[PDB]
Design a protein around this ligand. Structure first.
Ligand code: A1I15
Ligand code: A1I15
Ligand code: A1I15
Ligand code: A1I15
Ligand code: A1I15
Ligand code: A1I15
Ligand code: FE
Ligand code: FE
Lengths: 346, 347, 347
């Protein structure tokens, strides 16, 4: 038996072959365990990975066209999941997130699955990445019978994060740069989405930054008004996005099918917005883009490294997130790394 | 032919023993010193604490003895989870229990049931009063299990290896002794900070010539002291106990048979990086250490008394090496090979 | 409604409060700023520290309110002496506790008992982290006791009176600051010398633009530094805290509601005449002072921050008078008349 991220006891199945993904992008944690056979044990998933990660999807489709035939249990919201379609896939395990675009610990679907005799595991990369990322992988390892892959990934992760924390854990608060992260910048109805005590805030903390929204918000995600950002006038501005290159909607283009030219061109649009464009950080060129889906992925060590190099350029001159990304893919994944997951303003 | 156990009770020695019941699984450690190359041959069943709270030492014995998985578990990790029915159907001819711990005590119903069933019960203790009880416990186990030679051999080994410490620390006056705080299962409890009073690992601090800051804060062998009380006392030496497996992302110190030094140093450091702890003088000065938790209930505890002495007086015990003591212990008495890290220093 | 206390815990605000339990008696000081001319009307019971460790302020309130003697004492001066049974039979509708001090903390059993009984518990702090916690504590007490107006009035008063200091001392560079040692309950402890680190009266030294010599000697808010370490550091300014009653022949500094300037100066001098202390440069040069100890846990601590700034930079704060601040505090908020000596200079 194991304790999941909701504190609940889960009896590990003897053999797993029918994994249900409550949130599609929980695939990222699964991908680190399944080696060259990524989709072999997925009976169905939330449609967020296919619809909100179109780039990473297309790359896996070109090498694995059977991905199109994995059933979508819903669209991009917990409320759109048919519990009936879920149960007819006869899962032998269901992986859910404490938060996100899929069911949480108190949903009806979780109770239905408990009545059906199906083990449910809660992980978390989104609410409390710092507390939860590694424990989540340890647990997924045990319940999916991929302890070796999991232990390998934890060692890789700890080592690559320790490269940052060995330095930033000793830096005193008054020497840290102030940071604002604008999630899905440009692309929300009301500006400005950001992270508080949690989510990408954990990355700012680890990378030795000072999140200006840490004390403005009670939860992991929330909203701060444009004028509050202008008034705080933080040292460093970071925008997250995952927009596909050939999408004329507002947002930052980043992901597997994005070139540096397009990442720079679209970040600039984001930085040219009224108000934003007068920020000291934007004028001084301390303005950056990070791929949004790192907000819910155990690949988040790539962002902690990208934030650290932006917060202390020379102290992390020698650190290369692209090499960490390449080591990750070659050691663990079944596709080749492409595209741009981070960008600096021209 | 009768013996007095650690509960003051007389126990008549069985003519032949072949079905030993272990009230606490980790009481196996005392048994292992007697059974030579046939460690599990006489164990009918045991509490699940050894298998579930000592996964590393378990796995090593499993690789050499896969039949260990088939020894029945009479419960999980608490006295209240033991089914007395499963116990009695194993038809034990002796039951070994601890005065304290994760198994039944002298006043439990199960002890009375066993007395009604005609089964001798022996109380040992390595946990409440290690200094008073460890050697008497082994003497007794020797007599009731018909391994007097092994027991007497282990007592001589133990006394000699402890005397290496006490010859020096017994002459040191109180005012030249270091203040010490031991945080049991540091990082891994709900509320900080577990420790030992007059008993348990406190006995080891006493013997090794240290001054346990919790000796007078607590009435019993185990208890709790608040973080702020530790900060305020600001002791010269900080020690954290743990037994966490390397592959366990829960909080705590990794130590045991399957732990490397790098793993032990990295995980001790996490423990020392916690708010409050990290401002301790002992932590800043590098007088910060890790000890394997299960020494809190094992006659192998001479290893800890030695590690403490070398931490309490580094140069006066430069020449003492607990690893040589462990290697001699294993080769003389056990059926497995010593591996892993049972003690670590901070870098 | 709901609020966040000083332990990070959410507390549901009672609709009406009429039975306040004080975990530490001297938490009364925070309550007194809210209750106007009816100070004791809503107190069901309190720790005995206010009555036994603040005999002077007690006696003054007794002369105007003799019913104070009938408020139940839930214990003496230590968390361990509180009967949880007597507490629960008072049927409190709220309990106010301190993160630290002579009453229960966030992890005590009594706090859990009260949670089981359906009684809201609020943690405040004037003692561990006065700078971070004093004003947030008052805002919170305001909300849960339905005295938001009084609380907001006191915060404005406090901020303004502290700003009179910080406007000046916040711009002073470290190398122009005087070194300071504060000896808590000077002369009156078994082992010299109690003091404050990064917290407690240390926060006041920081705000008043001083350099606390124990800031980096200690991990916690309170601790101990040896006499010789003080002598060696030989700080610019020496401060002794006390609250001893005039007619008490025990050692310590006399300060409080019933102490005259001459009793405060005479008793400070005894404290400064002690072996070792009397060779300090600060003592010989007359930069030696007394501060009333209970400011170590009171939202009236703005009086200590102001007394400190005036000792640290006499001419820059020539025009500042902490006595006017106390009188403005008493007249605006309290139900008694200010008397006695809360601070003293050596002649
Ligand atoms: N399209 C919707 N109606 N909901 C979206 C899903 C869940 C929601 N998402 C976010 O708040 C969010 C914020 C910033 C950036 C993102 O990518 C986001 O997905 C959400 O998290 N809701 C909370 C509270 O209900 C939760 O599920 O815990
Ligand atoms: N809690 C909400 N109602 N909205 C916040 C999240 C929902 C929605 N998110 C996306 O469209 C999205 C796209 C790519 C990756 C993601 O994680 C996403 O969450 C959203 O942000 N909607 C905007 C309007 O488009 C909004 O509601 O502000
Ligand atoms: N999981 C539980 N509910 N109880 C655990 C077992 C019994 C308990 N153990 C400890 O207190 C303990 C403390 C520090 C370190 C350890 O390894 C521990 O096992 C226990 O000792 N109970 C006391 C009193 O009930 C006793 O048996 O004497
Ligand atoms: N007496 C108690 N109620 N708790 C303390 C002991 C119980 C538990 N112990 C262990 O997990 C354990 C592990 C390895 C070796 C041991 O000897 C153990 O006791 C424990 O400490 N639980 C924590 C919370 O999980 C706690 O009590 O706070
Ligand atoms: N009478 C006792 N045995 N203990 C008193 C408990 C409060 C204790 N007080 C001090 O340490 C103290 C030091 C200097 C000056 C003072 O006026 C003091 O009251 C205390 O603070 N305990 C801390 C740490 O244990 C706490 O409760 O967190
Ligand atoms: N926690 C401890 N063991 N000692 C520190 C404080 C205990 C005691 N305090 C007081 O008597 C006192 C008086 C007025 C106001 C306070 O806040 C007080 O704490 C104390 O100082 N004890 C002395 C012995 O006299 C000591 O322990 O050195
Ligand atoms: Fe989202
Ligand atoms: Fe235990």
């Amino acid at each position: 038996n194991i304790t999941d991220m909701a504190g609940r006891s889960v009896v590990i199945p003897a053999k797993v072959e029918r994994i249900l993904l409550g949130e599609g992008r929980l695939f990222y944690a699964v991908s680190l365990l399944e080696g060259q056979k990524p989709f072999d044990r997925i009976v169905g998933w939330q449609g967020d990975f296919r619809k909100l990660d179109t780039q990473t999807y297309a790359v896996y489709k070109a090498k694995f066209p059977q991905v199109d035939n994995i059933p979508l249990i819903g669209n991009t919201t917990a409320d759109s999941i048919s519990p009936e379609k879920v149960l007819t896939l006869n899962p032998d395990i269901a992986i859910f997130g404490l938060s996100g675009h899929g069911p949480g610990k108190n949903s009806e679907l979780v109770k239905q699955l408990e009545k059906a005799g199906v083990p449910v595991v809660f992980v978390d990369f989104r609410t409390s990445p710092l507390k939860n990322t590694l424990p989540s992988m340890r647990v997924l390892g045990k319940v999916l019978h991929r302890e070796q892959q999991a232990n390998d990934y934890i060692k890789f992760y700890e080592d690559n994060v320790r490269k940052v924390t060995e330095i930033t854990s000793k830096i005193p608060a008054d020497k840290k740069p102030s940071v604002f992260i604008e999630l899905r910048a440009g692309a929300m109805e009301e500006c400005c989405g950001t992270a508080g005590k949690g989510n990408m805030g954990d990355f700012i903390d680890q990378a030795g930054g000072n999140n200006m929204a840490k004390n403005l918000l009670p939860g992991a995600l929330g909203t701060v008004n444009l004028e509050k950002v202008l008034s705080t006038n933080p040292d460093i501005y970071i925008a997250s996005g995952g927009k596909a290159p050939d999408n004329n909607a507002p947002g930052v283009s980043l992901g597997a099918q994005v070139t540096k030219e397009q990442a720079q061109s679209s970040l600039q649009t984001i930085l040219d917005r009224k108000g934003i464009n007068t920020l000291s950080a934007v004028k001084n060129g301390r303005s950056y883009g990070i791929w949004h889906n790192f907000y819910n992925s155990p690949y988040n060590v790539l962002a902690i490294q990208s934030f650290a190099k932006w917060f202390y350029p020379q102290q992390f001159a020698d650190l290369d997130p692209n090499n960490t990304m390449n080591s990750l893919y070659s050691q663990f994944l079944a596709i080749e790394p492409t595209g741009t997951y981070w960008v600096d303003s021209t």
